Amino acid sequence: ARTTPIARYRNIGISAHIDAGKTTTTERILFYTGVNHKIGEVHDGAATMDWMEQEQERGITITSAATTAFWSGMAKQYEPHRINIIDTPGHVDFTIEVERSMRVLDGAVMVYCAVGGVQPQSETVWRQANKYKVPRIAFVNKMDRMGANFLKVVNQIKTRLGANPVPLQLAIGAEEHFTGVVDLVKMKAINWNDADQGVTFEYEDIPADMVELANEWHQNLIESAAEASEELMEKYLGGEELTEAEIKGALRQRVLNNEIILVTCGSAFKNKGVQAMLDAVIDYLPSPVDVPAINGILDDGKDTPAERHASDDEPFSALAFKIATDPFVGNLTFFRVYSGVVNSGDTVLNSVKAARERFGRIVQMHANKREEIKEVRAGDIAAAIGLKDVTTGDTLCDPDAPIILERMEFPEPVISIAVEPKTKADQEKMGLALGRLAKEDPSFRVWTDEESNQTIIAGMGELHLDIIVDRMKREFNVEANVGKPQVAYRETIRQKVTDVEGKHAKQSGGRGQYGHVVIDMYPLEPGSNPKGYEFINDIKGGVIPGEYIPAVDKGIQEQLKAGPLAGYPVVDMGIRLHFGSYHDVDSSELAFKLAASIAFKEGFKKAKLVLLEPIMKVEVETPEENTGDVIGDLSRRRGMLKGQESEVTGVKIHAEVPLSEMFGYATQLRSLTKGRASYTMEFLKYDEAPSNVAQAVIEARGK
Amino acid sequence: MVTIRLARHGAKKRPFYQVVVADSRNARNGRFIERVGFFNPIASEKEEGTRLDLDRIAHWVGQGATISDRVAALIKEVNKAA
Amino acid sequence: NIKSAKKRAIQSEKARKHNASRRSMMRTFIKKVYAAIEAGDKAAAQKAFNEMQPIVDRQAAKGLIHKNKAARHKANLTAQINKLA
Amino acid sequence: VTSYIGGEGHNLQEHSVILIRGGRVKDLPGVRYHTVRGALDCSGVKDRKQARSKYGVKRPKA
Amino acid sequence: ARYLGPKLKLSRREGTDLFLKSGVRAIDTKCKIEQAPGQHGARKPRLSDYGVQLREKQKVRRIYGVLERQFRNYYKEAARLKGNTGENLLALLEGRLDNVVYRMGFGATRAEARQLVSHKAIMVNGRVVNIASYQVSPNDVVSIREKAKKQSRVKAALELAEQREKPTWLEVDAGKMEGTFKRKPERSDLSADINEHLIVELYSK
RNA sequence: AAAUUGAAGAGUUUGAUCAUGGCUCAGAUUGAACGCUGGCGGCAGGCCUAACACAUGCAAGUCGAACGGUAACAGGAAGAAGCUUGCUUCUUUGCUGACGAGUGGCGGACGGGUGAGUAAUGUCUGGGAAACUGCCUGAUGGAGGGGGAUAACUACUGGAAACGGUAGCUAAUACCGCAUAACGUCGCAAGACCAAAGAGGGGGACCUUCGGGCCUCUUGCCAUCGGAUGUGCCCAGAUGGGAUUAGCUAGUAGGUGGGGUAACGGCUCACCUAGGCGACGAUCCCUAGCUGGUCUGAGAGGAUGACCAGCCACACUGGAACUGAGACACGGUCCAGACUCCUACGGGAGGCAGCAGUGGGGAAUAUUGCACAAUGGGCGCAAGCCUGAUGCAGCCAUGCCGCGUGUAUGAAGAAGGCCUUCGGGUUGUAAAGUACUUUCAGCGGGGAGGAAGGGAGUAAAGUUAAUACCUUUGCUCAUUGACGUUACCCGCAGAAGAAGCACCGGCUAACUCCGUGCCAGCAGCCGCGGUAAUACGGAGGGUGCAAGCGUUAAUCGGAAUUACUGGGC
Ligand SMILES: Nc1nc2c(ncn2[C@@H]2O[C@H](COP(=O)(O)OP(=O)(O)O)[C@@H](O)[C@H]2O)c(=O)[nH]1
Ligand SMILES: [Mg+2]
Ligand SMILES: [Mg+2]
Ligand SMILES: [Mg+2]
Ligand SMILES: [Mg+2]
Ligand SMILES: [Mg+2]
Ligand SMILES: [Mg+2]
Ligand SMILES: [Mg+2]
Ligand SMILES: [Mg+2]
Ligand SMILES: [Mg+2]
Ligand SMILES: [Mg+2]
Ligand SMILES: [Mg+2]
Ligand SMILES: [Mg+2]
Ligand SMILES: [Mg+2]
Ligand SMILES: [Mg+2]
Ligand SMILES: [Mg+2]
Ligand SMILES: [Mg+2]
Ligand SMILES: [Mg+2]
Ligand SMILES: [Mg+2]
Ligand SMILES: [Mg+2]
Ligand SMILES: [Mg+2]
Ligand SMILES: [Mg+2]
Ligand SMILES: [Mg+2]
Ligand SMILES: [Mg+2]
Ligand SMILES: [Mg+2]
Ligand SMILES: [Mg+2]
Ligand SMILES: [Mg+2]
Ligand SMILES: [Mg+2]
């Protein structure tokens, strides 16, 4: 039945900063397990994981791709383990993707560069992994590059991220003469062979060049491993050397509770270290049943609603972590079965939305390539064709299973752009493309603001957002150029008050009626009410008929609602009716509303009121070294500031900035802060601003 | 094999077959050489469920016509001896 | 291909080789008879006709050609040889 | 072809896509088609309450 | 598929009595039967040939509780059947199961007969029928089911079933609560106010 | 008995009339779409345009009762694993059930799809001769005898794969010669010539080399004459528009001879004649699958070919053939073209107009579903396997039909709206209130029928030489439904969960007020709106239809408005 035992299943992710060697380390993994005949290089687009045309051309991973392998051992020590590795992206432009893959996986191998070590995206993946408490290990890649030092990278990890790291494999030699690595348990130096592409290696006697630091760190490894149970420490302090098996098990325990991360070193480009990192994935990373079960809520929660041991007998439960786009079926749902068994054709219940979905074609994955499989067992990552409504993060299960799983959080887009196709009448096709790309990606949203015709595109970055437009050009072909959003202004009176009026000679004999109103315009103040329309009834002279006395406020709405000046609504206008004229036969309301309109018009021209811009509450965090640069950038713009606050891990700056300015502020912020700042918009009250554009939007049309 | 088979006419969830002597290549409801009686499967009442045309069926089977399984069963049940 | 109609393809090619061999042998024997009839030596034409006749009857029986085709060959050749005198 | 825009008030700009049906307006010589209101971004006649199946106006609650 | 509204409006629009109410009180005492239902009912619009044909057809439609599609079907069937079209049409309208139920009591109105037929309380010739359009046939025995006998409406309807002309084609046995359908009513066996040729020529236009 | 019983008009040229004459409406119908609304069930329908391009999964396999054989499972056999001479399982033996791959047989030419081409090589109707036909069936016979291979396999080997090489083999219902065959072929005659294959079940002997021989029955093979079916071919009539298409044709029309076809034939070749078709429309151009039938019409007729069924044609475009009874072959071969895909760059694979499904086009047309349980089809002695045929399920008020959204009672004729002559009227028994019912929807419980068959045992005869083994007909046994939480029945709660769409000047059924003021707007036709609009917009009221309604598109009718029936100058 089940091909591989549940213990011999690894669902692992490869997460780190941009270009740390993650996509290569995956190629060398697929090479040392024989599934790909050619090694392939990321720069020459040969990489199988980089299947999208953008990924080939720009040498970046714009998506998560899944693959499988069978790593027996370095000497075939263990039975073949089925490792499901989903390569992930490091660009801040695509963070949903890394968190998306990160949630389901049981372990993470965090790549690092020897030159740089801890980098901004490395802290980002660290915080994402820490919130989901995934057990982690680390690989220091690019040890061949100059400036390489294992020790410094270890110290950077300890000092910055916060973990206390235990070295597992040190490095023999400098950057160019990187022969191989020495393990701190078997006490063997696995020097790799240059002639062949890393497939073979030769074990040596760990020469005296590094025989004292090696012993020291080996001892530190022993001591760190002994902090798993009192039985380890008691024998350790007894003067006897612990056996390798208990050391490895105690380390596996410490990784399981996430106290420590095990750091291995190697260089994928130099075809070295990859076999040892995969070996340490088998030895130390957790299998699905090597942790306690996942929890959930049933019928608005319970004491212990679900503790589903991953097994082939319990009822089916899963999570759809990823949605992809297939032009030929219309969807591609990636799911991890946490506990249960499902098969082709089987129906499931989407617990959150309470509906029925049929699994048409469950398949397994090798990057873009798809291989049909009849059934999926528990703990396996697969893709489900035939799903047409399930959003990212929705639990898919058979009936009487946990309704809601913990995967209920997604980030907020920072960059907002507009887009408009060259031929304007491709709007329906573009809208369909945007709707699909927004349903698949929850961090990309498309809302068409109804003041204008523009389609608003929100994303995590300018890269993100332009990959979402050239991808449209290539697949589901449409040609569209991006631009800037338009302006949503409002108006406030510049402290002017009078008793203006309006009058038209509607009588003429035959017509039979006329209307006149005496109003009193005033503002209240900038931002005391949500309901800008204020009206306190006070009609004294010429009191109108008593069936529609309070009904002379809704008729004023059709002027305040939209468009008195340059097609922009108005806020804070107060009307106060004192006098007028009528005749109590049939005083026509619709032609009495003309007097009020001309009264508003006259009040507007005599008032000389000025335009009000949208200004929001941005809040930014940053390290206490770039405070000057960020505040200088806001000061260069017409931006106010609010809060002298310093956090413990940074500083929270609060600033009031316009909306027509600061277009693409996030990317500039990342540039001037080394990509280590975020922000948010709270849409606070509008503020006055001297603007040469405020009158140019109405003098474009003249009078 | 010129066959004598049921032709499956009628309505949804209530079949009513036509015993037709038709060449075995043509479809079930397709071209036939002759129709020899009907057969109502769902009849469980006084009116006759089935009716055959015994002399023409005998002529055909003497001319080498193949008899289907259900048509053989209806020839059986129609005869009093079986 | 896709299905197991490739077996019929191999059987068809082998049968084409065999049928082409045997049909060519038949046709060369009949060309021999025609050359004899066009030479005018009635005795060689009669011997050639009596040599081709069992060949064509055997193949007509096997099904490589039809009984009508064999009978047409024998009838035409007998008519030719009889008017040859 | 030329085509009428029925109802009271429209929103037809220079590139808006619309559905065209048969008809005639008779007083306009050369207009033999009518714009189907309330279909394909040609919004329905505002504040309409009678003959509402035509002009593409959704049902008020009332 | 059923008019759930004010029946008396219908009656006074046709002017005559459509028998859409029980005999508890007279028709005039419940509605102003003389005038039309509108606020302009007091006035009188001069009739037209199409007007009177439509009004006769609608009077028949409102009496029997039939909709236009079914009534058109009953006219295609009546035209198909040999003999006088209007006579066949009246037979097909009296053949309706709610019609025969009403004419046999058990409901003070044809809408009550529709409720009785629909709520699985009727057995025609043994088989429990609950289809209000069931075309009754000669020698059919209409029986009420158990758990429906002695209910308030059936008792009120049986007592109220008197004071009206007994149909000469039904031969109902009141006490045991079974009735027969010995033969279809002929032309002269009905209201005689219904001008059937008007409807026939309206539907043959 | 009955197979019909069937034919309506109106508005609009005019100051008004009568004719002529056109436009429009009332009806029926749709593979429909759009707008508004939407409860259920049954039966049907569902890419009308791009025969545009297709990812993916299935749409054709089967037979061990043809054969060599053993890859996988099981049963055993010999044991010196495990061991208490084993219940706690080591390998080998096709030995037996079985069976991957292979040789071979049959199917793959059926079923399914589409209408591009085709105006006549097609179809329909009615005949005909110059024909073939696997499987089905009847009649007569034969069914001696032998050989060479060869796949599979073994070895070496090449290739990324696809797929091969090169030697050694090993069978067969694979192939080949001989013998033999005449109411069979050729020949006027005489005469000459042509075939095969065996396998399975059991068994009284009796002989063996436990291979079996031998006796039975069941199938299978070969020849010939028949029938049935299916197919090929020919003739006549009919089957669109254009003369703003009058000449067309050189194998062209025919004859003789040779060749070819299963078969007649310029089908083809070599000569010879100079014919042949055409004003009854040849030739050319555009369009088009044809028919039973569908819609309409009282008919005659007009339009049409969605469903269903028959025939034809096509399978990415063009051409040619092979195997085979049958093809010039959807899911076969070869080539040329274009497209797409895999590649290790050396090469290789494919053709959804099969069922789903995608892109695109379009106003517009469904699920990447469940079973072979029914009936069929292929294979097989069967059991059984396969079948995207078929039976079902899903989506969509797309159509037709049926039902429900309550029923009775109820005058303060409530409030409120609207009109008002200010009296009142209308909304209106309508509501509320009172009494009663629970169809259908929702829960809970019972529950047909579509199921015939097939398998094992048994008995009876038929069978032989044998009560065995095989047919056939009964008796018993366990049984086979995807649909399916089936139809249907019973119970539980309560009127709860269920009404909208168009119109209201005349045609045409149903009128007033308000706001607008030749404006905004309505309209199928006549027309309306420039200060009292039943014609616009809203409100009240009413009329028609109703889970639908209206609009648009299309056909016929009305249209006697192409008038043959049935018109005029
Ligand atoms: N020198 C060197 N270059 C490396 C190494 N690993 C990867 N690279 C290259 O560095 C670049 C970034 O590595 P890549 O795997 O694309 O990173 P990712 O995009 O974050 O997965 C590519 O051009 C790689 O070929 C390494 O160990 N040494
Ligand atoms: Mg990468
Ligand atoms: Mg209905
Ligand atoms: Mg195509
Ligand atoms: Mg086999
Ligand atoms: Mg041999
Ligand atoms: Mg043979
Ligand atoms: Mg000849
Ligand atoms: Mg012509
Ligand atoms: Mg065509
Ligand atoms: Mg007519
Ligand atoms: Mg079709
Ligand atoms: Mg051929
Ligand atoms: Mg195909
Ligand atoms: Mg084929
Ligand atoms: Mg489209
Ligand atoms: Mg079957
Ligand atoms: Mg199937
Ligand atoms: Mg009132
Ligand atoms: Mg129910
Ligand atoms: Mg049954
Ligand atoms: Mg039975
Ligand atoms: Mg009227
Ligand atoms: Mg109309
Ligand atoms: Mg007015
Ligand atoms: Mg109006
Ligand atoms: Mg006519
Ligand atoms: Mg005339």
mmCIF file of C-alpha atoms in Angstrom, chain A residues 21-22 29 44 109 138 153 161 259 299 323 334-335 373 394 405 411 428 456 523 556 598 604 608 619 634:
data_model
loop_
_atom_site.group_PDB
_atom_site.id
_atom_site.type_symbol
_atom_site.label_atom_id
_atom_site.label_comp_id
_atom_site.label_asym_id
_atom_site.label_seq_id
_atom_site.Cartn_x
_atom_site.Cartn_y
_atom_site.Cartn_z
ATOM 1 C CA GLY A 21 22.194 29.965 -3.670
ATOM 2 C CA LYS A 22 18.744 28.513 -2.817
ATOM 3 C CA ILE A 29 19.756 18.126 -4.590
ATOM 4 C CA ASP A 44 22.094 30.385 -17.882
ATOM 5 C CA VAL A 109 16.852 24.764 5.464
ATOM 6 C CA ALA A 138 20.905 26.466 8.218
ATOM 7 C CA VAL A 153 28.367 34.182 9.720
ATOM 8 C CA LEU A 161 18.410 36.834 14.433
ATOM 9 C CA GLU A 259 15.723 26.079 20.899
ATOM 10 C CA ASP A 299 -18.389 24.368 16.524
ATOM 11 C CA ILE A 323 -3.146 28.113 -5.947
ATOM 12 C CA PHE A 334 -1.539 22.599 -4.098
ATOM 13 C CA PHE A 335 -2.494 20.754 -0.909
ATOM 14 C CA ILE A 373 -0.974 9.535 -9.200
ATOM 15 C CA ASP A 394 -8.845 26.921 3.068
ATOM 16 C CA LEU A 405 -7.225 25.720 10.660
ATOM 17 C CA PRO A 411 0.040 40.456 4.570
ATOM 18 C CA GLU A 428 -13.108 42.980 -19.958
ATOM 19 C CA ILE A 456 -6.127 49.868 -9.157
ATOM 20 C CA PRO A 523 -18.402 75.166 7.783
ATOM 21 C CA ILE A 556 -29.594 69.294 -0.977
ATOM 22 C CA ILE A 598 -28.366 78.550 -7.649
ATOM 23 C CA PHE A 604 -19.526 79.118 -3.783
ATOM 24 C CA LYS A 608 -13.606 81.622 -2.637
ATOM 25 C CA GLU A 619 3.579 54.686 10.245
ATOM 26 C CA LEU A 634 9.535 62.964 4.564
#
